[model samples]
Target: NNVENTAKEALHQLAYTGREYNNIQDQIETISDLLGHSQSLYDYLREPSKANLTILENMWSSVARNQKLYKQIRFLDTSGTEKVRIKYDFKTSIAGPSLILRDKSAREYFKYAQSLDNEQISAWGIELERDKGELVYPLSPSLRILMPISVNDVRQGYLVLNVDIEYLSSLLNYSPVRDFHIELVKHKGFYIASPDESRLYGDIIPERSQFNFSNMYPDIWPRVVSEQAGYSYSGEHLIAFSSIKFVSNEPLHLIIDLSNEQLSK
Candidate 1:
C-alpha cells in the first residue's frame, strides 16, 4: 500500500498541474473575447451620431449570438446613465425596451470606472451582485468586463459586459475522470470554487466564511500556501496544490483533494 501510494501521489501531482494549466488558458480566452468586442466598439464610436449608435446596437445583437454568455450589455455615459442598455435574450436580442433604460452611476462598477480611465482594460473575477453599498448573491453572477469607450480620441464612459464563466469553468470539467475533486481557492484561503456550491465565496458570504481552506485545514494550509506548488500523500488523503499568478493580482490555488478510501491497494 505504501509503495502504490507513492505512485498514486505522483500521478495526481501531474494531474493537478495539467488541470490548472488549462484553467489559466480558458480564463485567458474569456478575457480575449472581451478585448475583441471592446475594440470593435472602439471603431464604431468614432462616429457616435444617432444612426451610428443604432447601428452599433444591431452590431451588438449580431455578436451576442455567439457571445451570448455576456449578458446585461450596457454602454454607459460619463454620467452613469445607460446610453445603450440592450441585453441578450432568446430572440437575437437588441437594446431593452425604451421605458426601462436606467442609470448605473450609483453602482460600484461604474464608480470604479473613473479610476480605470488610466488602464486599457479592467476585469473583475467571478463576482457577486451589488445593491446599495452592500453585497448580494444572485442566480446570475458573472465576471465584470469593462473597457473605456472613446469617440474621436475623446474619452466617453465605458462599454461593459457581465460575462458568465459557467461556460469557461465547465470546459475545465470536461475531463471524463473526475476521481478527485478539484477546487479554486483565493490567496487568503477563501474557496472560489468548491465541490459544494454552498461553500463558495466565503470571503464575503458570512455564512460560508468558516468553509475556507485555512479554517477547515489549519494544519496543512500554512505550509501549503508557502510552497509554490507541491503534493503530499499521507495515510488518509492526497493533497496537491498549485498557484495561478495574475500579473497585477495575487495568486490563487488550484487544489486537488482526494480521499484515501477511493484509492484501492
Candidate 2:
C-alpha cells in the first residue's frame, strides 16, 4: 500500500505540472515510462545494503590506517622522460550485494570464513600444506592479515577489510614520494543484486566481473584470484577471494572477492 501510495502521490504532482495528455492511458503510459527509469535508479540504490556499505567503509578505513605504509613504495611506471609526475588514490572500496546467479566459488569462501571465526577475522594467511594445495591459516602474519575484529557476529550481514597503497620518489640519496596511483579495476568487474530482489526472496549475490591483469601491469603475474564452495541447496553456494597487485613495492598488495563462493567469476 505504501509503495502504491507513494507512486500515486508522484503521479498527482506530474498531472499538476500542466503537461496533461489524452487521459489515464496517456498518464499511465507516461507513469510507466517514468517507473521503468525509476526502477533502474531504485535498483541501483537498493543494490547496496548496510553490510555492503560497511564493507566499502572498511576499505577506505584500511587505506587510512595504512597511510604510512605507502611511503616506502616506489613507482616505476613513469609517464615520460621529463620526470613529470602524476598521482592517483591507491585506495578504494565497493558497496555491492550478492550475485545470486553468478559464480559460486567466492560465496563459499566468505561463508566458511564467517562460520569458522564468527566474522572476527584476526588473521588470514595461506600455508603450503604438503599435499593440500594451500591451507589457509587464520592468524596474524606479516604477508596478509585480516584486521583484528572486536567481536564475532554477522551484524552487518557481511564484513570486509580494505587496504590503501601510495607511490613515492627517491632522490640521489634522499627518497621522496613524487606521486601515488591506485588501480581499482577489480571493483569494476563485480555485480550485486538489488534490495527489492532480496526482499522478494531472490538471490542477493553479485555477477562475476571479467578480470585481466594487463590492466594492472604490462607483464608479470596478472591473474585474478577466484574461489568458492557449496551450500545445502547445492546450486546456490558462496564465493570468497580477491585479487591485488603491487604497482609499487609496498608491504602488501591485497584484494578480496567478498562473496560466499570459491570459484573464479
Candidate 3:
C-alpha cells in the first residue's frame, strides 16, 4: 500500500513536469527493412523504402525532446553545447519479456501482475536489449542512399535512441534520498537465496524527515518489497535500474551488504 502511494506520487510529479521515459519498440519494428542485418542486403537494400527513414526521424525527434526535458528537470547546462558526444561501435539488441500493460491502464496492469501466483513477477517498463552489432545497422541521412550496389555501401541501418543520462543525473541529485539498499532476493545477482536470507542486506538508519531518502526499502524489517510497488527485477536477467547512495550521518547504512548474496548465489 505504502509502496504504491510513493510510486503514484513520483509518477504524478513526472506527469506534472511532462516527463516520461522513451519507448522504442514500435520504431524498432517499423524500420526493420532498412536495418543492415543479413536481411537488408538480401531483402531491402535495392528497395526504395520510406518506412525505415520515417520511423528514425520520428524517434530521434522524440529522443531530442526528452534530452531537453531531462536537462530542464535536472537543471544542467553544457555551455552552448559545442561538445561532440563520444560513442562506441558495438551491436545492441534491447530484448525482454512482454507485458499486458499500457498507458492510463498501467495501474490495472500492476493489479493483474500482482494477482499472479508468483510474487516476484514484476510488470515494470518494457524490457529492452542492447546487444552487439547495433552500429553496423545504422540510421543517418548520409546512409539513406536512393540506390546501392554492394551491401557495405548501403550504410544500411536503423534508429539509435541516444539519451542524455548526464541530464538524468540532475534529477537523481535532487532526490529526497540517496544510497538506499535495495535487496532483491527473488531477483538479481547469482547468490540470492530465499527472501529469508536476503532481508539482512540493509541496516535502517535515522535521517531528517523530508530531506533524506536513504535505505529506501520497506519499513518492514524482512519484507522484499511492498506487494503494490511499481515493479521488481528478475533473477534470470540483468536489468537497468536507477539507484543512489551517498555518505550519510548513519555511516553503517552506506555499505550495502551484497556480500552474503554473492556468496549464497
Candidate 4:
C-alpha cells in the first residue's frame, strides 16, 4: 500500500507540473509558428508574375505595426537586393518603411538562403537586435527566419523576419507558484527566461555571457539533455525538468526547481 501510494503521488505531481509549464509553452509555440507565416506570405512571388514591391512595402509596414514581436520584415530579390523593407524603430516604437535599401547579395545569410531549395525554411539564429550592425541599447532579443522565395522555375531571392522576442524575459520569469523558481534555457549560451533578470540579457552585461546551462550545471545538465525529462530529489529539494524545442534541433530545458522553502502549502 505504501509503494502504491508513493507512485500515485509522484504521478500527481508530474501531471501538475506539466500543466503549469504548458501555460507558457502555448505562447512560445505561437511565436514559433510565425516563422511559417513568412514562408507562405511570399509564395505569391512566382514565375509569369513579376514582383511589385511598392504596395507590398506598405502591406508589410502595416503588419509591423500590428505585431508586437515582428520588429522588421524585408523582401530581397534574386540579385541580393533588398527590394522592399519595413522596420520598427525601438526609440519611437513606430513601424515605418526603410528609406534606403541595400545590396544583400554578398551577405552570408543571403548565401545561406541561396543554399535552400523550394519548400525549405531555416531558423537562422536568435541573438541581440542590431542597428547598422551595432547592438541596440537596452539590447533586445531577436530571432531571424530565412526562406528562399522560389518557384519551380523562377528564383526570387529571400524573405527575412526579424522578431523582437525580448518580452519573453518577463513572461517566463513570472512565478505563479510560490517558492518555485522557473528557468527557460536556450542552448545558444543564454537564458530565454529566468528569475535572475540580469542573466536573461547577457549582451547588456557580458559577465555571464560566456556561461549557460551546460557549463553552469556541468554534471546535471548533461543528464537533462541526454535523458530528456525527469525529477531530481536530494537534500529535501526537488527539481522537475523537461526540454522545450527551440526551433529545429535547437533544444532547450525548462527547469522547475523546487529548490527552497520546502513543499507547497
TM-score of each: 0.71, 0.20, 0.22, 0.67
Q: Is candidate 2 or candidate 3 better by lDDT?
A: 3
- Could you give the candidate ranking by TM-score, starting with the highest? 1, 4, 3, 2
**lDDT tens digits, residue span 133-187, model 4:** 5667866666666766655557666777776656543444444643345566666
Candidate 4 error regions (>4 Å): 1-52, 79-81, 89-93, 100-109, 172-181, 201-206, 233-238, 257-265
Worst 10 residues of 1 by lDDT: 90-99
Candidate number achieving the greatest TM-score relative to the actual structure: 1
Candidate that beats the other on lDDT, 2 or 4, i.e. the better one: 4
lDDT of each: 0.61, 0.24, 0.24, 0.59
Candidate 2 residue 171 C-alpha distance from true site, Å? 15
Tens digit of per-residue lDDT, candidate 3, span 132-192:
3122222110111011123444322211222222232233223345222232222221111
lDDT of 1 by residue, 1-265 (tens): 6535644654465455556545654664565446434655565556567676666676666665555555566677778877775566534434342334567787766777666763356665556655444564443455666667665556777777666544344445334453445576778788766556888778777787798888877776875688456666666776677676532245657777666765553
Off by over 4 Å in 2: 1-88, 91-112, 126-155, 162-265
TM-score of 4: 0.67
Return the lDDT, model 3, position 259: 33
Tens-digit lDDT string for candidate 2 (1-265) = 4333333332333232212212322432333233223332233224546554444334333432344222111111111111101111333422222222222123323333344342243322211111122332321111112211122332322222211111110111111231111122222232111111221111122232123332322222222223111111113322111232222112121221112242222
How does model 1 fare in lDDT? 0.61
TM-score of model number 3? 0.22
